[PDB]
Amino acid sequence: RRDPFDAARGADFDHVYSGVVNLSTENIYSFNYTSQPDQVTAVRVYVNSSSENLNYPVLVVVRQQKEVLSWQVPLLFQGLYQRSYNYQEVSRTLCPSEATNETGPLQQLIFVDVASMAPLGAQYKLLVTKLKHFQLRTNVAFHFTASPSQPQYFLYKFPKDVDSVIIKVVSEMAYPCSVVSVQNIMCPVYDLDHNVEFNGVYQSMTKKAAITLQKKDFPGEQFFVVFVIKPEDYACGGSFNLQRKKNLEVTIVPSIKESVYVKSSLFSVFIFLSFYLGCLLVGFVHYLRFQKIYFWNIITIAVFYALPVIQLVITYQTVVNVTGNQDICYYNFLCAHPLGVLSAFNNILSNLGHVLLGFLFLLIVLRRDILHRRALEAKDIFAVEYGIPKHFGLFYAMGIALMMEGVLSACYHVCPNYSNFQFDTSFMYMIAGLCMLKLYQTRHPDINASAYSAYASFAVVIMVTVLGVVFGKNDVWFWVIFSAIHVLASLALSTQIYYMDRMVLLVVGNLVNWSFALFGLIYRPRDFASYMLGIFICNLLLYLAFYIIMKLRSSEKVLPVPLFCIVATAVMWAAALYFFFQNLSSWEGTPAESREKNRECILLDFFDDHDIWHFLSATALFFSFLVLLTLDDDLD
Amino acid sequence: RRDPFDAARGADFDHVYSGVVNLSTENIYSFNYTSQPDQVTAVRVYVNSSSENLNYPVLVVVRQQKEVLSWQVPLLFQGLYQRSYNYQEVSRTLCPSEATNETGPLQQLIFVDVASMAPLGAQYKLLVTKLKHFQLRTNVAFHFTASPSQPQYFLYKFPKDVDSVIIKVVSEMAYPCSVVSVQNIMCPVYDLDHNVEFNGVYQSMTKKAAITLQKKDFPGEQFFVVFVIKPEDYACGGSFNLQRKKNLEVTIVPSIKESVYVKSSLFSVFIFLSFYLGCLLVGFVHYLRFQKIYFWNIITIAVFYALPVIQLVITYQTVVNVTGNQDICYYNFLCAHPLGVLSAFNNILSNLGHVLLGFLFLLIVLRRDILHRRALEAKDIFAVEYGIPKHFGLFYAMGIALMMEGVLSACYHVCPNYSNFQFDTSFMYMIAGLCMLKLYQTRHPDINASAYSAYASFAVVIMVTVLGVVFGKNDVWFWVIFSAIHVLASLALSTQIYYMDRMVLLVVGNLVNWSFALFGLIYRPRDFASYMLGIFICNLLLYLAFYIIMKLRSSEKVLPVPLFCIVATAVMWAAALYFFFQNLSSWEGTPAESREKNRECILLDFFDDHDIWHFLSATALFFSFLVLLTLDDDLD
Ligand SMILES: *[C@@H]1O[C@H](CO)[C@@H](O[C@@H]2O[C@H](CO)[C@@H](O)[C@H](O)[C@H]2NC(C)=O)[C@H](O)[C@H]1NC(C)=O
Ligand SMILES: *[C@@H]1O[C@H](CO)[C@@H](O[C@@H]2O[C@H](CO)[C@@H](O)[C@H](O)[C@H]2NC(C)=O)[C@H](O)[C@H]1NC(C)=O
Ligand SMILES: *[C@@H]1O[C@H](CO)[C@@H](O[C@@H]2O[C@H](CO)[C@@H](O)[C@H](O)[C@H]2NC(C)=O)[C@H](O)[C@H]1NC(C)=O
Ligand SMILES: *[C@@H]1O[C@H](CO)[C@@H](O[C@@H]2O[C@H](CO)[C@@H](O)[C@H](O)[C@H]2NC(C)=O)[C@H](O)[C@H]1NC(C)=O
Ligand SMILES: CC(C)CCC[C@@H](C)[C@H]1CC[C@H]2[C@@H]3CC=C4C[C@@H](O)CC[C@]4(C)[C@H]3CC[C@]12C
Ligand SMILES: CC(C)CCC[C@@H](C)[C@H]1CC[C@H]2[C@@H]3CC=C4C[C@@H](O)CC[C@]4(C)[C@H]3CC[C@]12C
Ligand SMILES: CC(C)CCC[C@@H](C)[C@H]1CC[C@H]2[C@@H]3CC=C4C[C@@H](O)CC[C@]4(C)[C@H]3CC[C@]12C
Ligand SMILES: CC(C)CCC[C@@H](C)[C@H]1CC[C@H]2[C@@H]3CC=C4C[C@@H](O)CC[C@]4(C)[C@H]3CC[C@]12C
Ligand SMILES: CC(C)CCC[C@@H](C)[C@H]1CC[C@H]2[C@@H]3CC=C4C[C@@H](O)CC[C@]4(C)[C@H]3CC[C@]12C
Ligand SMILES: CC(C)CCC[C@@H](C)[C@H]1CC[C@H]2[C@@H]3CC=C4C[C@@H](O)CC[C@]4(C)[C@H]3CC[C@]12C
Ligand SMILES: CC(C)CCC[C@@H](C)[C@H]1CC[C@H]2[C@@H]3CC=C4C[C@@H](O)CC[C@]4(C)[C@H]3CC[C@]12C
Ligand SMILES: CC(C)CCC[C@@H](C)[C@H]1CC[C@H]2[C@@H]3CC=C4C[C@@H](O)CC[C@]4(C)[C@H]3CC[C@]12C
Ligand SMILES: *[C@@H]1O[C@H](CO)[C@@H](O)[C@H](O)[C@H]1NC(C)=O
Ligand SMILES: *[C@@H]1O[C@H](CO)[C@@H](O)[C@H](O)[C@H]1NC(C)=O
Ligand SMILES: *[C@@H]1O[C@H](CO)[C@@H](O)[C@H](O)[C@H]1NC(C)=O
Ligand SMILES: *[C@@H]1O[C@H](CO)[C@@H](O)[C@H](O)[C@H]1NC(C)=O
Ligand SMILES: [Zn+2]
Ligand SMILES: [Zn+2]
Secondary structure, three states, rough: EEEHHHHOOOOOOOOOEEEEOOOOEEEEEEEEEOOOOHHHHHHOOOOOOOOOOOOOOOOEEEEOOOOOEEOOOOOOEEEEEOOEEEEOEEEEOOOOOOOOOOOOOOEEEEEEEEOOOOOOOOOOEEEEOOOOOOOEEEOOOOEEEEEEOOOOOEEEEEOOOEEEEEEEEEEEOOOOEEEEEEOOOOOOOOOOOOOOOOOOOOEOOOOOOEEEEOOOOOOOOEEEEEEEEOOOHHHHOOOOOOOEEEEEEEEEEOOHHHHHHHHHHHHHHHHHHHHEEEEHHHHHHHHHHOOOOHHHHHHHHHHHHHHHHHHHHHHHHHHHHHHHEEEOOOHHOOOOOOOOOOOOOOOHHHHHHHHHHHHHHHHHHHHHHHHHHHHHHOOHHHHHHHOOOOOOOOOOOHHHEEEEEEHHHHHHHHHHHHHHHHOOHHHHHHHHHHHHHHHHHOOOOOOOOOOHHHHEEEEEEHHEEEEHHHHOOOOOOOHHHHHHHHHHHHHHHHHHHHHHOOHHHHHHHHHHHHHHHHHHHHOOOOOOOHHHHHHHHHHHHHHHHHHHHHHOOOOOOOOHHHHHHHHHHHHHHHHHEEEEHHOOOOOOOHHHOOOOOOOOOOOOOOOOOHHHHHHHHHHHHHHHHHHHHHHHOOOO | OHHHHOOOOOOOOOOEEEEEEOOEEEEEEEEEEEOOOOOOOOEEEEEEEOOOOOOOOOOHHHHHEOOOEEOOOOOOEEEEOOOOEOEEEEEOOOOOOOOOOOOOOOOEEEEEEEOOOOOOOOEEEEEEEEOOOOOOOOOOEEEEEEEOOOOOEEEEEEOOOOOOOEEEOOOOOOOOOOEEEEEEEOOOOOOOOOOOOOOOOOEOOOOOOEEEEOOOOOOOOOOEEEEEOOOOOEEEEEOOOOOEEEEEEEEEEOOOOOOHHHHHHHHHHHHHHHHHHHHHHHHHHHHHHHHHHHEEEEEEHHHHHHHHHHHHHHHHHHHHHOOEEEOOOOOOOHHHOOOOOOOOHHHOOOOHHHHHHHHHHHHHHHHHHHHHHHHHHHHHHHHHHHOOOOOOOOHHHHHHHHHHHHHHHHHHOOOOHHHHHOOOOHHHHHHHHEEEEEEEHHHOOOOOOOOHHHHHHHHHHHHHHHHHOOOOOOOOOOHHHHHHHHHHHHHHHHHHHHHHOOOOHHHHHHHHHHHHHHHHHHHHOOOHHHHHHHHHHHHHHHHHHHHHHHHHOOOOOHHHHHHHHHHHHHHHHHHHHHHHHOOOOOOOOOOHHOOOOOOOOOOOOOEEEEEEOOHHHHHHHHHHHHHHHHHHHOOO
16 A cells, blocks of 8 residues: 655755656655644645646645645636636645644644656646745735736734724736635635635725625634636626736725714714704894795605615615625725615715705795795785796705605615616706796796696606616717707707897807717717716706896896805805716726725715715705795895 | 556446555555547546544545546535534546547546545545446436535537427425536536536526526537535525435426417417407497597606616616526526527517507597597587586596506516516506596596595505515514504495495495405415405405496396406406416525426417416406496496
8 A cells, every 4th residue: 555654755845846747656745844822824835837738737636634635737727709728837825724722732744746647747846835924914014916826815813802894905907807705714715716706705806995894793703815816807897928917915904983973973963954053043033133736746756766776775785785795786895884784874874965955945945935925815016016926836846856866865875786877866857957947937927837848858868868878888879869859959948948148049059069069079978867967957057147147137136145145056066066076986887897996085084075975966956946046036 | 756556456346445544554546448439438436434533534536637636535514503514425426528539439547546644544435436327318307316415417418400408307305405507518517515606507496497508509519417415405495324315307308499489479469459350340340230637647657667677677687698697587487488688588478468458448448539529519418318427538547557567567577576576567556546436436426536646545555565575574563554554444435435235335344354354364475466456356346346236226227248348357357366376486485496386388388377367467457447438338
């Protein structure tokens, strides 16, 4: 029978052994070592076959007390479209074994067998090294490299007090993909291409990655972090001595404390309770000085838009929570602080304004309407010769639209996905439509088109946006059709509005023409919903400015409050647009690329660009509504 | 250096070799054979270690020309909640290699090394066999067994003419879960728990599995079918010498031809064009004898309900088509014949009735209304003393509702899922509500409650169904509240309708209480939408019967047409209810259990139970609408 010790070459690490193997010869090495308490050892084996022989690859086997590994040196990889890759270098890190005080020091023996089947002979170069850069320390950076045939991994231990940590991985060149996984301390460790996704959370990456971990999940308060390269780049983006070495840097930082949650929530509540305080103060000062269809329509639409997306987000959140695959939701992982089951608490709590400001506007408008109704009950002719008809439903509809938009944005931000590009700014389409209708009706007679012209316009707009995003991704015929339809609609609107100021239609048409030229040259927004939002905002602002200039030309004085409101609306729009243009993550594109553009929070230690965008959108909409309501106070 | 031949024990298959291994002793066998053209050989290795030694397992390494395998005898499996299992027998199949005529006969060697590290020694029994039942033949069954540590797989080759095949796997005891995968002929083959899902299509199963495969995808027209058992049953259902042998039977059958498609399409079209032909002939015979809000409401609701579901289903279908994981959509896999990109073409084409019947009903109602308007233009006092008010909006609303329900059902059936449990029969809620409203308006005066009473009722009903299904899965308080609310609603409806026939209110209340007791003693429908449909159908039929019997008590003769329509409606309703009670697949429950109840098609070789339910529902609803419209002909 075979004797290992007899033929075993008592060897030592760090020595570059060389040899040649025939059909009737096997080489065996018998490395030995010891492990002491409080320290972790991780041997690593490198094998390079200088020869390129492929019909008789070298076979390598590693044996320990309780594990066996085996592979080939000329590693062969198969890729789509019948492509073959051959790597002539291989490496592997053996699973470590802890040594406690009770166990004491432990002696370990490792057998390495190299054998081939080539009739003539195959060369091989073997190397074995200990690892000193194995453990990881919080807040301390680290650099290394990996390859398709050289997967890597390291260990981390949980400090005494830290209850949550964040692992951030950064590269420079995103040519080949990579996969980063986290696993418990239980050998074996699946650091291979086809089994790295079996266990533990994992993330695809090309230039950035971030993973948040708790402490109660892991027994023993330790875990292994595994990095694996991929032979091909199809999954992450474009197409695909052969090597693909990738340089990586990994950092681990403790997470924030609940004090951040308390401070952020209190600040968010009070910053917008201040508006109610100011409104009550102004009402008190004024009192001292003095000393229908929309309702059911909006309720039905709210339920219709709420139930389906709400169930969808519930299911998606549950699935991502259970499976542990962080590639379904298009979060911004750099700043996404979870609470309970919720994974992104900030992006939802940053929606308080879209509700509070809307409810305040509802309250103020209702009070004004009730006061006017009581005054009319008392009767006064001053509002006939020196007054104009008053309407109420439009403002309530605007406010309820604002509340529903806030709730829709929250539900959408629960878990972003490519199937939810709308529901984020859909109701601001209605808000702009209501503003346009209010402006049309205030000047010209009522001539109400009931209420369903706006609903038809909204449905058509949504249909066009969805069809363009789903199908007009790479086509241009649909783009030409949409451009022609937009130009025709603009011309028709100008003609209808027209019937000293004869050049206003020309100005608006020329602006829109510059717009078509702009994106015809650009011809690649790739986000139809964002443009629809922008164009509706443009039209709203242009029409408001035109009406204000017309009123000024009419030789009347604007009350100071509407003037201040208009200026505040302009500045708030400026800030909100600045924050909106900032892009963090995007549903379009592979999840590897979407995370590539992330940022590490601004303002407090909680919020980022999108939250400030929510805040500015809410406040700017509130002030625009106030401008619309209070502009014509001087007429009475 | 070590010498394999010097220590090689030239062995033979089918002999149970026995041995004992120490730290310094490892045994090696050198099996040898030859493969001839037109035959496939697949060795198989069984290793059993009698001892239970866990600290010092026996390590086995198998070496071939171009591959290396390795494992331990006492295989260890880790399961959730910190559970450990050990299996003392292992088996494996070595990847075969074809031998072409040009290549000629090929000699092959296989080295099996058994080595351990126990200080004293461990026993081992080794068996190596050839495989004769490796290839699979079309339409021929096959029986075998698998174990968590003994995965299996076989080869299949595409016949000359077969262009698509179906693989069906059947078991008897659903205790241990299983996975069935299909892969291309390119070694290695992933038949392990942690890497079986990496490549090729696959399906989880407990009692039944079915997979459909084309020909152009596979180069060489061959593929491997791999069956792998799982240590625990958490994924596919409930909770978890040790052994979990599972017996399986496999069948492979060629798929249908396009003539089936042509036959099914022609039959589906002409069965429902027959109704138009018959109506035209009836009108011909009659001629020879003679010789607004709803529109906008429904158009808005159409887009409002459709766009999100359409986009979601498009994304789901694309992802399932590309990724190849057949566990997202809850199809009925046994009879799902795909066309182009669509995966279940039959379940979509089976909705033609919901549109054709609706269109015919709208045409007929419009014709009748137009001739009535012409007659009124000519004027006739007969329809005053012996006439009743005539309305038109409700019938068009019903027709449009049917036409929209057809598209909603099609969109839902594109890919059923737990997030689309509605949209399969949701619009028929409104259908029943509008039928109820029409009946109420017919006898009593107009007293129109506009149209939004039904809108609010539908929104509230959908909200209740959603919150019950998503939340009320396991709770009883919500069920008690719902029962109380429904009893109160029944009492209120009875009181309102009441103000010879003094006992009908008691009868309806008692029927409601009987349903109460039924679902309070069963306490397990677990399908809120289904019971909502049942209850709407029940009250609709009850009111129809009450009205018809009251009309009978009024001493007037009904025209033969209403009698024929009522009888046909009753019969079609019974048939549709029967076909509805049949259960094929279900979104609730794991995908393994959903497929456990599937059936192999009825009628032609295309359609099955659910399609028949669609047909019957369409026809029965059309006849019910006709009954309502033509019931009161005798009055004039
Ligand atoms: C085995 O490997 C050796 C290369 O080291 C070669 O065989 C050797 O041949 C020389 C010259 O005849 C002998 O002196 C050695 O004793 C042989 N050693 C062995 C291990 O065979 C050859 O490359 C391989 N064997 C064959 C048959 O090719
Ligand atoms: C296999 O090939 C690689 C690369 O050709 C060898 O890696 C070299 O290692 C030395 C050691 O410092 C470096 O100076 C060289 O720069 C490395 N090569 C390259 C291309 O950078 C490796 O030594 C060879 N053998 C083994 C067993 O890995
Ligand atoms: C090696 O296996 C054998 C069990 O068969 C044991 O060692 C044997 O001991 C006897 C008595 O001294 C010798 O005659 C044999 O030559 C030994 N065989 C070998 C292979 O060493 C023992 O279980 C194992 N070795 C040790 C050191 O325990
Ligand atoms: C390992 O153990 C298994 C059972 O634990 C042995 O399998 C037996 O195989 C024979 C061969 O026909 C059957 O008659 C027995 O019924 C099987 N055992 C049982 C419990 O049913 C097997 O022989 C052992 N060794 C190997 C190498 O498999
Ligand atoms: C009523 C209005 C104000 C609510 C608006 C936000 C809604 C959509 C939020 C508030 C609370 C949230 C829920 C809180 C907890 C969980 C449990 C988790 O396992 C699934 C998601 C689920 C069920 C959340 C879904 C989203 C949710 C329902
Ligand atoms: C406009 C909205 C976002 C403003 C905030 C209101 C709602 C959504 C907030 C207020 C209080 C919040 C809850 C507070 C505490 C918990 C318990 C935790 O285990 C799950 C989440 C859950 C249940 C939160 C979900 C979101 C919540 C319901
Ligand atoms: C970001 C992508 C989707 C493109 C959207 C562009 C939008 C947000 C931008 C581009 C052109 C801009 C407009 C250009 C000119 C004017 C006239 C000015 O008197 C009021 C503001 C207004 C109306 C701007 C508002 C913001 C605007 C509409
Ligand atoms: C004409 C009126 C409407 C303008 C008021 C809105 C202002 C604040 C908007 C309009 C266009 C916007 C800019 C568009 C593009 C850029 C370039 C980018 O690298 C930094 C932000 C910056 C500079 C934006 C900041 C905000 C911005 C200046
Ligand atoms: C015109 C009305 C009646 C059509 C009603 C059926 C609808 C839902 C059907 C008709 C055509 C179908 C599409 C045909 C082909 C594909 C390509 C596939 O990669 C994604 C799904 C998609 C895009 C289908 C989605 C469902 C679909 C849109
Ligand atoms: C459910 C009701 C509304 C469907 C009635 C409309 C029929 C004619 C529609 C619905 C879905 C359609 C199919 C959708 C997708 C494809 C795949 C493509 O490669 C060929 C055309 C084909 C096969 C379409 C033919 C027309 C089609 C069958
Ligand atoms: C199938 C699941 C959801 C359970 C519900 C079953 C439903 C559809 C069943 C159970 C009780 C049944 C009703 C029992 C009694 C009557 C009165 C009769 O004059 C007409 C049929 C009618 C109205 C039945 C229609 C079908 C019905 C409503
Ligand atoms: C005509 C109107 C009043 C409907 C009358 C109700 C009839 C048609 C319904 C009520 C209960 C139903 C039965 C309930 C259960 C089963 C068992 C199943 O294995 C076959 C169908 C069968 C036998 C159903 C057939 C249809 C059925 C008999
Ligand atoms: C190395 O020395 C012997 C030789 O294999 C071995 O038995 C022992 O356990 C090892 N001890 C240390 C300290 O490495
Ligand atoms: C082992 O002893 C060292 C001695 O300082 C101590 O620091 C360490 O905490 C001990 N570990 C255990 C597990 O007892
Ligand atoms: C078996 O015989 C020898 C012994 O190993 C081997 O070299 C040869 O290739 C084999 N021949 C056949 C016909 O199996
Ligand atoms: C090999 O020869 C046999 C002889 O009958 C024939 O049937 C088979 O088709 C041939 N195969 C090839 C690939 O030539
Ligand atoms: Zn947002
Ligand atoms: Zn159906």
